[PDB]
């Protein structure tokens, strides 16, 4: 129900580090617990994480176990240094989603009316994406489709948590991720936005071979919705080049 | 109940083995495998001949023991209210039901729809409007049931020949395909649902993409067999080809619901014919001169204006109408299906533009490692 | 002193409201879950009973804990109208009793059974293997009508007992009424 | 029959949850407020001259969700305590409060 | 019936609430046995787009609150000396104001012994102001029943030494009520709406 | 009675926690414990703090509330991974890098708890941009 | 600093008003009786 959701760069790395400390005796690469934070605006965000050992079985993807007690009492205990801090949704790792999600949705909902699912990747970084957000919509797949699950995502964005910049600048202090040397630091800039554009370009390539071939369930039915407008939508024409032949080369030459 | 017990063996070859289970069930006190034996019973090959009798012996049975299952017994003593086929007290009867079952469950909503099923079959008038607007809007916190939703979709489908839903009719009608797949009823008599579902997309007026029907195997396959034609012209309208001598054979083939509104079917295919350029071309052909709108839609000169401001109007192209040289910019923002056996096309250009975004990342590097090496 | 930390698994299938027990079969094994509580906190009021479910989900909210009166108010409105998943049920209270105990609170986890159930002989079989394997120290109980002490309940409770283990018995019950009192009679004392 | 005297449960439940949410509503606020001072100078866009009603005046920020449309000069609004910018902006009255 | 289960959530949420109650009130009330600054209610009756509260504080500073955090504004109008939080600047909890200096206790009295048998000669008249002042205040539930409201205003003309400060004083004593004692002659002040 | 160069590995969450729970209780002088371990003499590491609310009374030992750090620690234990308190932390707005008489006070009954018990001031209003 | 007191409540609180004009409210010291405390008299306060 929610517009969308924003993640702050303040429950990522705790997730990861819980990820961590609970990993050494559970090696089941299934890290589940609960996401806090605050929905003000439908502008969903996190401010507090918790991990609890997991455990489970492939058969049907039903067995599994929480501290439920110890979880709730965390909850209180956060609730009452801040009271702000409200359970937003449950995160669970190991991106490939197995089918008990759909019974702990149900079991956590009673915290939380707009379930949410977050997977963090803690080893993988593929391009830049630290965590996804998941939304449960399992109101009719489509007007002439099956039913099925369909957990869709909810666009999510790393937000900017304030008093956080001076940690971060001290932490790394090695690297600037900031536009110091604007020159060289805007020729990175565009240098992996081309490295992400073609990467991501290249996976929806890939998607339309993939679709073309057959070989995977096909979902047209919003693939075709969201792309043809996008392919059709004239940025090709040049003639408005030629109404705006000066488009800036009058600053151009006046830069020259 | 000992009694009815004895009474009821009767009536029925292979019933006192059923009757005997039903002695045991309630016995030990069962109410859910009751329920499974009534509804074994109902389902038995038989025409339920004594409608009344079975009535008065399942109230019996149900309000001597008080502890049965509501959703599943009334799904099952729906059949017999049904068959007692008297509308004047079958309404009574559905307010018996649901006074002996007035929870929120799927027995009232249960009610409500066979009330209107009741209203369809005598007396258009009284109550039909509000009773099939209530059930969508008592369908709330209820995403997956798929029962009742299955059953709502079957009365609006069939609410369809009434005035208030024609395109919201083919609508619930596709989710009732969607959340029933199997078969469960003859191969006919849903080729003769696609061939309504096709009627009413072809008098409708808002279904430009009326997607999940146009190249959908699961209605197509029914007439697979007959009225190919009609597989034919639902392809036209998808892709966009004329086959103006098909689609006319389409419109005197099948005779009623078609014959007035082939004018309307007229409109919709010239108004659809132009998509098949709308995403083929991305801009490639941005000049829609009116030869070219001849060749796509075969219509004359006077006709160009208003099919273009329907098309405006509808969201096929939204862009610039000239008349010197009658140019129509291209810009859609009303996708449709785009025959994903031709998606070869859409991929093609896809790898067009990551081979030119690579090569030019490639040439401005080339231009590049005086600062990047 | 030798403390026990029992978790109970309850069956919660559609059937269980019946009235085959005076008020409902789901009631009369709620009244076997805290009679045997009862006990428990009579040996000792800090022994910890819990409750799982297998009707399609596994209920964790009432822990491993020494108050029943969570179990009573959870339990009840626990709207018996799902299926049975025998296999899911036990194996995920052996998780949820695993958890966090005392090595020396004797872990234990008892079954209601009060329904037919309709799984596979191999899947219960590959179960009791496996429990068998992980030395899991089960004993079931039945209720009311139900295909009782069925082959896969007798293998199942025979490979968690035997082999010199505690040797828990499962009771095989008249349909309908049974008496609890000497359903859990041998448990309560001897296994 | 002990489920007759569900209504008075009912009452008593209702009666205390009123007493609840007033406190959850007390306890989950605890809040600083904010200082009051009025737009001695509006400056720019981006910073503005907010003076405090004894003494010091602050080059601050604006409200993200207000607008200078709202601010305006010379006009009571609220500072935030620590971080020193624009939280809401507040009419002001005076009174005589004589032989009115 | 459901009574079990939902009595047993009934007094659990009852008891673990009034213990939040407690804890948060707690939390509080130490603030609210430190407050500090006077409350000078510029009060603005910001609706939530319901209340609000301006605070002159004691070392001259305005703290704007909002929606009076914490007190009703049915008790608390705009005025003064109501405790405001030292720290969280919000509105702590009502206390007593001030009696303007003079009126602190100008000479109240906490209550006067003089009793009625000592005074008398005039015992129709203390007898006909006793029933119209202090059956007023023993009786006030006769003349709310009744439905007549006691007149108030009873004017003792008469030369000097004939009792009325022993007859008024002890009239208060038999109410058993608070009396408050109001030098006349000395009420003309020169300073602008002292009086 | 050997204190030598010491260093605090710090983790960067506990920054996190410490720079929100200071954001939250910016006038409170909000308490708390930094939940760290003596690995050895020197080497002090710190993987985790929490965040406790102030009594009303003030900076007390009874502030930090004796059950509830014992249940929060349980729940560490339980879910999470269990970690030692040998230090404490504490939003510092007043003044900079020394301690109030009764932060003395409270540090001293810690240290007599504990080994070291470290006294750690973090100022959370002079951490603007730069300088934590 | 030491201020005079204002008055104070049935028993435990005390409305103070204090030299540095504040609405001055605290528990009196463990170590002293309300008693010994009457309204109108300088009593020193301890910054904390
Ligand atoms: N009826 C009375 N009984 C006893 N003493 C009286 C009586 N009337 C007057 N007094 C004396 O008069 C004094 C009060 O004088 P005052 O109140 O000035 O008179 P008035 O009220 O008529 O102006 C008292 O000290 C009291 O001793």
């Not at chain 1, 995502?153 to 971060?168: N, Q, R, Y």
């Not at chain 2, 959340?179 to 009413?200: H, N, W």
């Not at chain 3, 989900?57 to 020494?66: G, I, K, Q």
Request: proline residues 4%; contains cysteine.
């Amino acid at each position: 129900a929610v517009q969308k959701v924003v993640v702050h760069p303040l429950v990522l790395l705790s997730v990861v580090d819980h990820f961590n400390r609970i990993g050494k005796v559970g090696n089941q690469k299934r890290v589940v617990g609960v996401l806090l934070g605050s929905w003000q605006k439908k502008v969903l965000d996190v401010s507090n994480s918790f991990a609890v050992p997991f455990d489970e079985d492939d058969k049907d993807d039903s067995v599994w176990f929480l501290d439920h007690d110890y979880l709730e009492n965390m909850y209180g205990m956060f609730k009452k240094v801040n009271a702000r801090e409200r359970i937003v949704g449950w995160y669970h790792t190991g991106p490939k989603l197995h089918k008990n999600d759909i019974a702990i949705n149900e079991l956590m909902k009673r915290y939380c009316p707009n379930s949410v699912l977050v997977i963090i990747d803690v080893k993988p970084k593929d391009l830049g994406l630290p965590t996804e957000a998941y939304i449960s919509v399992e109101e009719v797949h489509d007007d002439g489709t099956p039913t099925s699950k369909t957990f869709e995502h909810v666009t999510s964005e790393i937000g900017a948590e304030e008093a956080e910049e001076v940690g971060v600048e001290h932490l790394l202090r090695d690297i600037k991720d900031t536009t110091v040397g604007t020159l060289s630091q805007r020729i990175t800039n565009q240098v992996h936005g081309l490295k992400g554009l073609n990467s991501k370009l290249l996976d929806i390539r890939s998607y339309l071979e993939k679709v073309a071939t057959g070989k995977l369930p096909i979902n047209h039915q919003i693939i075709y919705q969201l792309q043809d407008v996008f392919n059709l939508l004239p940025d090709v024409s040049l003639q408005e080049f030629v109404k705006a032949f000066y488009l800036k080369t009058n600053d151009q030459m006046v830069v020259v | 109940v000992p009694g009815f017990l004895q009474q009821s063996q009767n009536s029925g070859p292979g019933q006192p083995a059923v009757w005997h289970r039903l002695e045991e069930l309630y016995t030990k006190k069962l109410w859910h495998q009751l329920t499974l034996q009534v509804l074994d019973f109902v389902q038995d090959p038989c025409f339920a001949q004594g409608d009344g009798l079975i009535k008065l012996y399942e109230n019996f049975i149900s309000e001597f023991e008080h502890r049965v299952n509501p959703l599943s017994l009334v799904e099952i003593i729906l059949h017999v209210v049904r068959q007692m086929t008297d509308p004047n007290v079958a309404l009574t009867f559905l307010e018996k039901t649901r006074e002996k079952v007035k929870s929120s469950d799927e027995a009232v909503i249960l009610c409500k729809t066979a009330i209107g099923a009741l209203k369809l079959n005598i007396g258009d008038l009284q109550v039909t409007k509000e009773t099939i607007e209530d059930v969508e809007e008592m369908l709330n916190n209820l995403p997956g049931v798929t029962s009742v939703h299955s059953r709502f979709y079957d009365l609006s489908s069939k609410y369809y020949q009434t005035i208030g839903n024609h395109a919201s009719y083919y609508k619930d009608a596709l989710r009732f395909l969607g959340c029933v797949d199997i078969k469960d009823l003859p191969v006919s008599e849903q080729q003769e649902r696609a061939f309504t579902l096709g009627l009413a997309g072809l008098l409708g007026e808002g279904v430009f993409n009326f997607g999940e029907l146009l190249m959908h195997p699961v209605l197509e396959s029914l007439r697979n067999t007959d009225r190919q034609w009609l597989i034919d012209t639902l392809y036209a309208f998808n892709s966009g080809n004329v086959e103006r001598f098909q689609t006319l054979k389409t419109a005197w083939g099948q005779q009623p619901d078609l014959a007035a509104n082939e004018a309307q079917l007229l409109r919709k295919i010239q108004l659809l014919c132009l998509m098949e350029m709308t995403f083929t071309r991305p801009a490639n052909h941005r000049q829609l001169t009116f030869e070219e709108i001849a060749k796509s839609a075969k219509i004359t000169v006077n006709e160009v204006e208003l099919l273009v401001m329907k098309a405006l109007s509808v969201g096929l192209v939204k862009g610039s109408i000239d008349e010197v040289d009658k140019r129509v910019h291209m810009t859609w923002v009303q996708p449709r299906v785009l025959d994903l056996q031709q998606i070869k096309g859409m991929k093609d250009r896809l790898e067009f533009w990551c081979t030119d975004v690579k090569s030019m990342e490639m040439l401005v590097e080339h231009q590049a490692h005086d600062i990047l090496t | 002193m030798v403390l026990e930390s029992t978790m109970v698994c309850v069956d919660n299938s559609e059937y269980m409201r019946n009235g085959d027990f005076l008020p409902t079969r789901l009631q009369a094994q709620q009244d076997a879950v805290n009679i045997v509580c009862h006990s428990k906190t009579r040996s000792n009021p800090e022994n910890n009973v819990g409750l799982i479910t297998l009707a399609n989900d596994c209920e964790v909210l009432t822990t491993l804990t020494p108050d029943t009166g969570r179990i009573l108010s959870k339990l009840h409105t626990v709207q018996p109208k799902g299926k049975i998943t025998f296999c899911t049920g036990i194996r995920v209270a052996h998780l949820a009793l695993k958890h966090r105990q005392g090595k020396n609170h004797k872990m234990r986890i008892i079954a209601f059974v009060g329904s037919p159930v309709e799984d596979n002989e191999k899947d219960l079989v590959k179960l009791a293997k496996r429990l068998k394997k992980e030395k899991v120290n089960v004993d079931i109980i039945n209720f009311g009508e139900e295909e009782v002490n069925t082959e896969k309940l007798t293998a199942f409770v025979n490979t968690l007992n035997g082999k010199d283990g505690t040797g828990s018995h499962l009771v095989t019950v008249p349909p309908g009424p049974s008496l609890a009192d000497a359903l859990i009679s041998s448990p309560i004392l001897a296994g | 029959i002990d489920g007759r005297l569900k209504e008075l449960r009912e009452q008593l439940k209702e009666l205390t949850k009123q007493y609840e949410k007033s406190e959850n509503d007390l306890k989950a606020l605890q809040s600083v407020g904010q200082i009051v001072g009025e737009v001695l100078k509006q400056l720019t866009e981006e910073k503005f001259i907010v003076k405090a009603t004894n003494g010091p005046r602050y080059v601050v920020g604006c409200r993200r969700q207000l607008d200078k449309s709202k601010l305006k000069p010379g006009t009571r609004v609220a500072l935030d305590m620590t971080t020193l910018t624009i939280m809401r902006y507040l009419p002001r009255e005076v009174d005589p409060l004589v032989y009115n | 019936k459901i009574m079990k289960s939902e009595v047993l959530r009934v007094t659990h949420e009852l008891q673990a609430m009034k213990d939040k109650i407690k804890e948060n009130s707690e939390k509080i009330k130490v603030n609210k046995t430190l407050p500090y600054l006077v409350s000078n209610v510029i009060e603005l009756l910001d609706v939530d787009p319901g209340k609000c509260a301006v605070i002159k504080t004691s070392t001259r500073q305005t703290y704007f609150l909002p929606v009076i955090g914490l007190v009703d504004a049915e008790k608390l109008k705009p005025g003064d000396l109501v405790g405001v939080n030292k720290d969280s600047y919000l509105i702590l909890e009502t206390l007593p104001t001030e009696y303007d200096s003079r009126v602190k206790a100008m000479e109240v009295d906490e209550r006067p012994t003089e009793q009625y048998s000592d005074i008398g000669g005039l015992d129709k008249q203390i007898q006909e102001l006793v029933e119209a002042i202090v059956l007023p205040m023993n009786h006030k539930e006769k003349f709310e029943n009744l439905g007549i409201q006691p007149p108030k205003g009873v004017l003792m003309y008469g030369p000097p030494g004939t009792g009325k400060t022993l007859l008024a004083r002890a009239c208060a004593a038999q109410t058993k009520a608070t009396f408050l004692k109001l030098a006349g002659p000395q009420l003309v002040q020169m300073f602008i709406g002292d009086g | 009675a050997v204190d030598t160069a010491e260093q605090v590995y710090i983790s960067s969450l506990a920054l996190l926690k410490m720079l929100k729970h200071g954001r939250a209780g910016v006038p409170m002088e909000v308490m708390g414990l930094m939940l760290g371990e003596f690995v050895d003499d020197y080497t002090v590491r710190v993987i985790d703090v929490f965040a406790m609310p102030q009594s009303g009374t003030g900076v007390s030992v009874e502030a930090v509330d004796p059950v509830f750090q014992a249940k929060m620690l349980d729940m560490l234990k339980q879910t999470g991974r269990p970690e030692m308190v040998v230090g404490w932390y504490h939003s510092h707005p007043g003044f900079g890098c020394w301690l109030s008489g009764v932060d003395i006070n409270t540090q001293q009954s810690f240290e007599a708890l504990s080994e070291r018990a470290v006294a750690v001031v973090v100022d959370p209003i002079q951490s603007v941009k730069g300088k934590v | 600093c030491t201020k005079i007191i204002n008055a104070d409540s049935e028993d435990p609180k005390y409305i103070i008003n204090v030299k540095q004009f504040a609405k001055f409210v605290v528990d009196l010291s463990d170590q002293v009786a309300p008693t010994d405390i009457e309204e109108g008299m300088r009593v020193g306060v301890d910054r904390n």
